[PDB]
Design a protein around this ligand. Structure first.
Ligand SMILES: CCCCCCCCCCCCCCCC(=O)O
Length: 91
């Protein structure tokens, strides 16, 4: 999934993880799309590395916001918009 997408999608929610008046539902949804489009470790990797990339290239990512997204979005998974994910294997 062409990285820039990931970022261009995550970006408003990123505002949320740093201190945004989010999320608007959009995240949960767009997120699932990347989680539905990406299926096995290999597609996810590129994307995770990019979403992570931004998590890293933010100010003070607030763990909650991030974990929260799968937690409330209901995307039953190991990763959630962070700098330190299991992007590695994802299994
Ligand atoms: C494992 C690859 C990660 C990206 C694709 C899987 C979905 C990531 C789950 C977190 C979604 C983040 C929502 C937008 C960013 C944010 O909440 O600030």
């Amino acid at each position: 999934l062409n990285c820039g997408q990931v970022d261009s999608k995550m970006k408003p929610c990123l505002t949320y993880v740093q201190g945004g008046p989010g999320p608007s539902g959009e995240c949960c949804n767009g997120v699932r799309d990347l989680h539905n489009q990406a299926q096995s470790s290999g597609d996810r990797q590129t994307v995770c590395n990019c979403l992570k990339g931004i998590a890293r290239g933010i100010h003070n990512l607030n763990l909650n916001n991030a974990a929260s997204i799968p937690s409330k979005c209901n995307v039953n998974v190991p990763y959630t918009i962070s700098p330190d994910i299991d992007c590695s294997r994802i299994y």
